[PDB]
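Agenda item 2: zinc ion complex prediction
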Amino acid sequence: HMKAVVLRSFGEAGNLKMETMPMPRPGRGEVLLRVHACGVCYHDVINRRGNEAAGEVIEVGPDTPGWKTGDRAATLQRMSCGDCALCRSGRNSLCKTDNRFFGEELPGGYAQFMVAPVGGLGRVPASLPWNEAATVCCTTGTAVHTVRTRGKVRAGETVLITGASGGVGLSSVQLARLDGARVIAVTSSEAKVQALKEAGADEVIVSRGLDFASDVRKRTQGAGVDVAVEIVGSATFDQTLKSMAPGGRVVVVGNLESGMVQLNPGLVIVKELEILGAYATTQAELDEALRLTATGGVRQFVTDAVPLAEAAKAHFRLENREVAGRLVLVPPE
Amino acid sequence: HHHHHAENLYFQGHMKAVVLRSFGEAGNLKMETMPMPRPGRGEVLLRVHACGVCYHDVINRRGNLPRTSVPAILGHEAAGEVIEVGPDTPGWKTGDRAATLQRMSCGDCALCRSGRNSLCKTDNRFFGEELPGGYAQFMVAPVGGLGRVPASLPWNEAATVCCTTGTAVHTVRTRGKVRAGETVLITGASGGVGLSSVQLARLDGARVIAVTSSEAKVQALKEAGADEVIVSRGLDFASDVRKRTQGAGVDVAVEIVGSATFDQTLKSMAPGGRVVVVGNLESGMVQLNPGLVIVKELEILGAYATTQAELDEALRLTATGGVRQFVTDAVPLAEAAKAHFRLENREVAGRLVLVPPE
Ligand SMILES: [Zn+2]
Ligand SMILES: [Zn+2]
Ligand SMILES: [Zn+2]
Ligand SMILES: [Zn+2]
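Presented output:
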């Protein structure tokens, strides 16, 4: 047997039912994990309507060479098949052969136990506390795919980050600076200014999302930034494109839920801007994200740890924007 | 000082040229007798045999280009003959065949050194705006803004290459990087840029799917190298492409129309596809949906202007036949007003050319 939180009917935050469930058994090329912590990012609130954890390896399944008992591991969000045309090409976030996503087709991490294939796990260094390790893939893990893999930030470039207050934002500020770039952060609240500074931001602009283009210009000596991390949800797109320098790059990341944004094709044309989608974290990207966390080059900002039984209270605090940071669910022993 | 006996330089005096002395209606264009320009250091004097009429010229004529100033000689799509060179013109001699770009480029800033001449800010002078255009028998041109016309290419066809096949090279190759085997979606394929893009894509070993508004514009696009053609105003072709592509989508899309077809273009893209945006005919804004760009990791690339190398290549493609030129009517220079009227009222399908008198 095994204790877990289950959702059988979409709707309200209180529908997350603590059902006693059976323990899963790993198949060929799979492993059983004892969940020590599991983060709640707003994508789960989206899944709570109709539209990220870490633990110890206790039982290894057949055809699992690299892994043993007691090994530390953290899970991605999207499973990725091995050898397709896009995987061998490095475009693992677009594979359709194995589109399995944790918390959906594969049992989520709201359980004391869970199984995961080999390719969907990243080794967690021994230095990492479990709470912080469970919030890496959807913060720093997304930062690696956005800042490095897709955006390809280079030392000597200036990066704009809209909606910089958040899991992906604060990790993108750190990583972009760690790779030798200057960081201009845009936030909506004065309170989030000091955090962005402590995270390494060279400039922090407080804007509702319709007036910062000029300030980003004055701060770049009229040149404009080379890269933009567009974290949708703040109504900032028009000002972002105007903040770009000629040939600048805009890497779009965020949730599907946010409405359509204001696009002026003229700006893209005459400035030859590159708007790039950035989606899923790769196993290699997660391994790097976990290292950068152990290293100290990219921190985590855990607001509070919550018992797994209180999963309904977690989604409520996250639904009403009554939290600043990333909450974690700890299953009982 | 500097006395000479050259009869040809002495004859170089006055010239015929369409002059615009007040921005406004097409009728403000009037042939006049102007003094010939003199080429200076790094410049070249051209004997214009033809100048393409680009709708850009219409906007310019109305005063909607801020840096243009009356009196003005319009036109940026000129093809002519080098009759005189100034000092520091090592690659250019009298008798050479040249065609002007749209705008200049300094060649020294980081952007220029990177091949991004379209984005140069230090020298953004346009032909027919800050410096005189091709609506005339002669014009001066910095060597940096000239492309070479093969001897096998007539003037009329050459005077319409920059703003069609020239743009196609920049869009399809330099920016789009279309590779043989990919499926290419082209909107507004029936236009000047579209027709050149269709040919250039089919020439690069790619399957071309054209989307035209005209119902009976298919016989040309098909003959132009298009494997598939779709008739649509721009709101219902997305599903038709997914049907003609076995539900896979397209690898790259050449968005010439812009806002009118953009939302459907995106939905028509395969995972990891890239949209190369070059035009926005209706000047309308777009409601971009982030989810489709993210989940599929799509790329939206802008393409602007043409470089000296791209025009040399575009001109070469027309002389060889890889990308034909569809010149409707050749019009005397003195009838520039009539040309704009035709172009404004959409009463023409193809490219118009102004031929200066001898
Ligand atoms: Zn997550
Ligand atoms: Zn795959
Ligand atoms: Zn330059
Ligand atoms: Zn033009």
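Discussion summary: Residues 212 and 266 of chain B are 17 Å apart (CA to CA).
Owner for follow-up: CH.
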